[PDB]
Amino acid sequence: ADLMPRVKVQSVETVEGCTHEVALPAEEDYLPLKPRVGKAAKEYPFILDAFQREAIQCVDNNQSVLVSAHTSAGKTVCAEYAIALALREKQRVIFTSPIKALSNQKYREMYEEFQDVGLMTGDVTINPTASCLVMTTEILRSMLYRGSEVMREVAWVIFDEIHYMRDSERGVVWEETIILLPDNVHYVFLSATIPNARQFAEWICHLHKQPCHVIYTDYRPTPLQHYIFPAGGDGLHLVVDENGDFREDNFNTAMQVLRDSNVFKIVKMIMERNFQPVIIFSFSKKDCEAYALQMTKLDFNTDEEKKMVEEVFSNAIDCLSDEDKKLPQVEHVLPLLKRGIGIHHGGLLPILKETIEILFSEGLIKALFATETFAMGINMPARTVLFTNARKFDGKDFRWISSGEYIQMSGRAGRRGMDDRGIVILMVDEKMSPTIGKQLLKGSADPLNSAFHLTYNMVLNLLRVEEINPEYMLEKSFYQFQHYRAIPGVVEKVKNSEEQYNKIVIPNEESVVIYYKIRQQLAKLGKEIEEYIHKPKYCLPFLQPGRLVKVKNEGDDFGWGVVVNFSKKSDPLYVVEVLLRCSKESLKNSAAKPAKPDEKGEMQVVPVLVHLLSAISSVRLYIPKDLRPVDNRQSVLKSIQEVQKRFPDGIPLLDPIDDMGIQDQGLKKVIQKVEAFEHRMYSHPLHNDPNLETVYTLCEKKAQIAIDIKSAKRELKTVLQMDELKCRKRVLRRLGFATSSDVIEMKGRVACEISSADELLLTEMMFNGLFNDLSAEQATALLSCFVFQENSSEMPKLTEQLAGPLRQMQECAKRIAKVSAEAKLEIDEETYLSSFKPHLMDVVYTWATGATFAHICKMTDVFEGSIIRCMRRLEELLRQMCQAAKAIGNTELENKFAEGITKIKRDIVFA
Numbered sequence: 044a045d046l047m048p049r050v051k052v053q054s055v056e057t058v059e060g061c062t063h064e065v066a067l068p069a070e071e072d073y074l075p076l077k078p079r080v081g082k083a084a085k086e087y088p089f090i091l092d093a094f095q096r097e098a099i100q101c102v103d104n105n106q107s108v109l110v111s112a113h114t115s116a117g118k119t120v121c122a123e124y125a126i127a128l129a130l131r132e133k134q135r136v137i138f139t140s141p142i143k144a145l146s147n148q149k150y151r152e153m154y155e156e157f158q159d160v161g162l163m164t165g166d167v168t169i170n171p172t173a174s175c176l177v178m179t180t181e182i183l184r185s186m187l188y189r190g191s192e193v194m195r196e197v198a199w200v201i202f203d204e205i206h207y208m209r210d211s212e213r214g215v216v217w218e219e220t221i222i223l224l225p226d227n228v229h230y231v232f233l234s235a236t237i238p239n240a241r242q243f244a245e246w247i248c249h250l251h252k253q254p255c256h257v258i259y260t261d262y263r264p265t266p267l268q269h270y271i272f273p274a275g276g277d278g279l280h281l282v283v284d285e286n287g288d289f290r291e292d293n294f295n296t297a298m299q300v301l302r303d304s305n306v307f308k309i310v311k312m313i314m315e316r317n318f319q320p321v322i323i324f325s326f327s328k329k330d331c332e333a334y335a336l337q338m339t340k341l342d343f344n345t346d347e348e349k350k351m352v353e354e355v356f357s358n359a360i361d362c363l364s365d366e367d368k369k370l371p372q373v374e375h376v377l378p379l380l381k382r383g384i385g386i387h388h389g390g391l392l393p394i395l396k397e398t399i400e401i402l403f404s405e406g407l408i409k410a411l412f413a414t415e416t417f418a419m420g421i422n423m424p425a426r427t428v429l430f431t432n433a434r435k436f437d438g439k440d441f442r443w444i445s446s447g448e449y450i451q452m453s454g455r456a457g458r459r460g461m462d463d464r465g466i467v468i469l470m471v472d473e474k475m476s477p478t479i480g481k482q483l484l485k486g487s488a489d490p491l492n493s494a495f496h497l498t499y500n501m502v503l504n505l506l507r508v509e510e511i512n513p514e515y516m517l518e519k520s521f522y523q524f525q526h527y528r529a530i531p532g533v534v535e536k537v538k539n540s541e542e543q544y545n546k547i548v549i550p551n552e553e554s555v556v557i558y559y560k561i562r563q564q565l566a567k568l569g570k571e572i573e574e575y576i577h578k579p580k581y582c583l584p585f586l587q588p589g590r591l592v593k594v595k596n597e598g599d600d601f602g603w604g605v606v607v608n609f610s611k612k613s614d615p616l617y618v619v620e621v622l623l624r625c626s627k628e629s630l631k632n633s634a635a636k637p638a639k640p641d642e643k644g645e646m647q648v649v650p651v652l653v654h655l656l657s658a659i660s661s662v663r664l665y666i667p668k669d670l671r672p673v674d675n676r677q678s679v680l681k682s683i684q685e686v687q688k689r690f691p692d693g694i695p696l697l698d699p700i701d702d703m704g705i706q707d708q709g710l711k712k713v714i715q716k717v718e719a720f721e722h723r724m725y726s727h728p729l730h731n732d733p734n735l736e737t738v739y740t741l742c743e744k745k746a747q748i749a750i751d752i753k754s755a756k757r758e759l760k761t762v763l764q765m766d767e768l769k770c771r772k773r774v775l776r777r778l779g780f781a782t783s784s785d786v787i788e789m790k791g792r793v794a795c796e797i798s799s800a801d802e803l804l805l806t807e808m809m810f811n812g813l814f815n816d817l818s819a820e821q822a823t824a825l826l827s828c829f830v831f832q833e834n835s836s837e838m839p840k841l842t843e844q845l846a847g848p849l850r851q852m853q854e855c856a857k858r859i860a861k862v863s864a865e866a867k868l869e870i871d872e873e874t875y876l877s878s879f880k881p882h883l884m885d886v887v888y889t890w891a892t893g894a895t896f897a898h899i900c901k902m903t904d905v906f907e908g909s910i911i912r913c914m915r916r917l918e919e920l921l922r923q924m925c926q927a928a929k930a931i932g933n934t935e936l937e938n939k940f941a942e943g944i945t946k947i948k949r950d951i952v953f954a
């Protein structure tokens with residue numbers, strides 16, 4: 044209907060310390076907020092910082108608020124006031140958080156103060172009905188879709204960590220929950236620094252016809268000072284200050300040492316100088332645990348503290364069974380804890396990881412080694428954060444930690460009250476340019492950008508609800524609320540087109556354009572002559588050492604340089620090391636950049652792929668070996684220079700047809716045209732005319748301005764992900780889930796219940812009788828495959844009791860890939876059937892028999908924690924599958940799956 048968002052942000056004057064703006068519908072006029080009609084919903088012992096006061100007042104005026112501030116500032120102060128007005132006026136409230144662990148402590152942190160609280164997480168329902176219900180975002184989405192009544196009395200939904208909407212996988216759940224939520228509800232959003240905070244406000248203003256205020260402060264309660272440890276270095280160096288200033292001088296020095304037990308010295312130093320507590324963030328479970336055993340050589344705890352650790356560990360581990368209290372981890376973790384040394388990793392049994400968390404808060408662990416995700420976990424802030432590496436593997440390739448990652452993990456430094464200041468240390472193992480360090484340490488926080496991925500649970504559930512259609516979510520989605528730039532695209536199109544018209548009177552007649560095409564086509568034909576020269580059959584025999592070759596990147600010309608070697612590394616791609624002039628700055632780089640016109644620059648060895656060589660020259664010149672010294676590298680410049688002085692036209696070049704090699708391929712045809720175009724040029728009347736250089740330059744601007752105008756017009760159709768819904772709707776109709784008129788069918792309504800896993804395969808397998816005629820023990824293992832997505836494991840040999848079911852899951856999985864392909868979906872059959880992993884299948888059947896976890900832990904190499912996560916996720920899948928069978932009324936299946944939940948739910952898991 045071509046109806047687009049019409050929302051205006053109006054600035055609200057702010058006392059020093061906050062930026063307050065108010066997103067409002069354009070039609071609605073701005074009225075200043077009313078003040079404190081009620082004396083106080085809640086009273087805080089602490090003296091409120093200015094941002095807290097402006098945000099709370101918005102809660103008071105029943106106007107929605109979005110808060111962005113650093114992780115030690117009092118963002119929660121805003122959540123607790125909202126919960127207080129809600130409990131006071133009796134309106135029900137919900138707190139929704141990204142991870143379950145934030146919720147389990149937050150239920151308790153909220154329960155003590157309020158005591159009319161409930162927890163809704165898949166693992167547990169406590170006080171299922173209460174005025175304040177802590178719901179994970181995932182259960183809210185289920186509840187909103189299920190037509191549950193808990194959302195009837197809610198007028199405040201508190202979305203903590205809305206900056207977790209960015210992730211592709213769970214970003215749909217937050218965006219979906221906000222759209223499904225009624226326009227009546229007012230929402231308080233708690234986020235860390237986000238550059239695009241205003242846009243989020245405009246979404247909740249357009250989406251819910253209300254004002255979403257935005258409060259932004261850069262306040263950090265405890266100043267953080269950033270440090271870097273060069274390898275093999277006596278001391279730490281101050282790269283960044285409390286004032287935030289970047290010290291390049293020290294950073295290059297710290298770097299300078301880098302050109303030419305390490306953790307133990309840094310940890311020991313921190314402890315001696317009272318920089319404790321230190322969270323050492325290692326990127327691997329193998330590195331973190333192994334590092335701790337290094338510090339076992341030192342005792343960091345008092346004798347009184349050791350008794351307190353023993354009293355806490357045993358009170359905590361009393362819950363476990365006597366055979367269970369002797370598991371290989373339980374015995375081993377206590378000694379490390381006594382010394383003040385702790386491990387926080389996802390390979391940990393859950394009861395132990397919570398004990399480590401309670402002790403660190405209580406001060407009984409003074410050096411905690413943690414994997415990154417402890418960062419996502421609530422609180423547990425420290426004085427010093429130490430990074431055992433500056434690079435984290437992305438699976439496809441190893442990469443430096445993103446600016447955003449340093450900002451989260453560095454913010455666990457600076458306890459607000461105990462520490463006057465906070466200290467952050469990075470250990471760098473590879474050369475880094477100042478440009479990388481300025482971004483990693485001083486990086487602006489990542490923008491909050493949508494990752495709306497359509498899921499069959501999204502399409503199927505929306506078909507069930509009568510009022511809404513799957514397409515509704517697409518239009519109200521954050522991804523289609525970037526409609527805010529279409530109006531900008533139009534402003535450039537008209538403005539640029541008017542500019543072309545002012546240029547058109549200045550531009551000359553089409554006769555110059557005719558030359559431009561002949562000049563441009565000859566350049567285009569020229570690139571084709573180069574494509575043949577780069578070919579590894581002809582170029583490589585000729586890329587001998589000492590040769591004069593010219594290297595050009597995209598938009599960068601390095602110019603003449605002398606080859607040092609010929610080699611194959613990384614259709615194979617061949618790498619030639621060509622000495623090329625490069626900026627004196629490129630010496631610092633770990634990406635080498637061509638010398639600027641200002642400086643002569645310094646020659647250096649830049650690995651160059653053969654594909655980048657513009658030209659190969661028939662002049663080979665001497666390269667001194669030991670090209671390390673600045674004098675030897677610069678000497679070649681004088682030698683390449685004499686070749687340029689001796690020859691006026693330029694260095695001679697080897698003709699591909701004769702000197703370079705056998706051009707059996709018809710380059711003669713590209714060359715045949717090249718000469719004629721040169722003949723067409725020059726013969727063209729406008730050749731070498733007086734003031735031609737300026738006369739021709741204008742012609743280029745008009746062409747490129749047209750390119751800019753033409754290109755922008757292509758990007759201005761809408762309907763961005765409709766092809767995916769269209770293809771996804773077709774797979775559902777074919778498989779049997781929905782009718783051709785888009786009405787859900789009973790096969791479909793079962794899949795709406797299985798939202799913890801692949802709804803399509805499990806509902807289709809359920810129909811083909813796969814689950815039927817299988818012992819509950821066999822069924823529990825097969826459903827595990829859906830909820831295990833790890834790696835670096837070898838399948839335990841599977842007997843026909845467990846392999847035969849697996850061979851049959853694949854057949855349904857192969858069909859779903861095939862129906863998906865004929866539906867123009869992007870599924871690759873191999874990944875889909877491999878997505879479900881059979882690695883932990885024999886560790887779930889053995890658990891079903893009644894074997895203790897220790898037998899189970901031995902059967903597979905997986906860390907104890909991967910087994911616990913798979914098992915509670917399996918208990919839910921079983922719970923979702925048993926409800927699904929109610930719809931089809933299969934009595935055995937509902938009981939068989941319910942039998943499975945009882946057999947699996949035992950001992951240390953589900954503690």
Ligand SMILES: Nc1ncnc2c1ncn2[C@@H]1O[C@H](COP(=O)(O)OP(=O)(O)O)[C@@H](O)[C@H]1O
Nearest residue numbers: 089090091092113114115116117118119264459
């Ligand atoms: N006025 C205040 N200034 C600074 N810190 C405060 C203040 N009041 C409470 N705090 C402390 O700061 C934290 C409150 O903010 P927090 O819950 O960390 O927000 P978020 O988790 O959203 O970053 C808690 O440690 C709290 O005890």
Ligand SMILES: [Mg+2]
Nearest residue numbers: 119203421422
């Ligand atoms: Mg928090």
